[PDB]
Amino acid sequence: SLGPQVAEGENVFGVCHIFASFNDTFVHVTDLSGKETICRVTGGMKVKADRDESSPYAAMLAAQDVAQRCKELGITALHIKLRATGGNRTKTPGPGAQSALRALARSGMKIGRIEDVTPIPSDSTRRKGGRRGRR
RNA sequence: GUUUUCGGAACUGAGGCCAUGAUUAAGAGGGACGGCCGGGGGCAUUCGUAUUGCGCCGCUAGAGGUGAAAUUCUUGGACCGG
Number of H helices, E strands in chain A: 2, 5
Q: How many CB atoms lie within 10 A of CB A133?
A: 7
Q: Give the CA dihedral A118, A30, A112, A107, nearest 10 degrees.
A: 110
Alpha carbon distances (Å) from A20 to A11, A71, A81, A130? 27, 23, 10, 26
The reply to whether A51 has its C-beta less than 7 Å from any atom of strand B is: yes
Q: Give the CA-to-C1' distance from A42 to B79 in angstroms.
A: 10
Number of residues that make up chain A: 135
Q: Which residues face A26 on adjacent strands?
A: A42
The C1' atom of B22 and the CA atom of A119 lie apart, in whole Å, by 80
A32 touches strand B (CB under 7 A): no
Element (H, E) at A18: strand A13-19
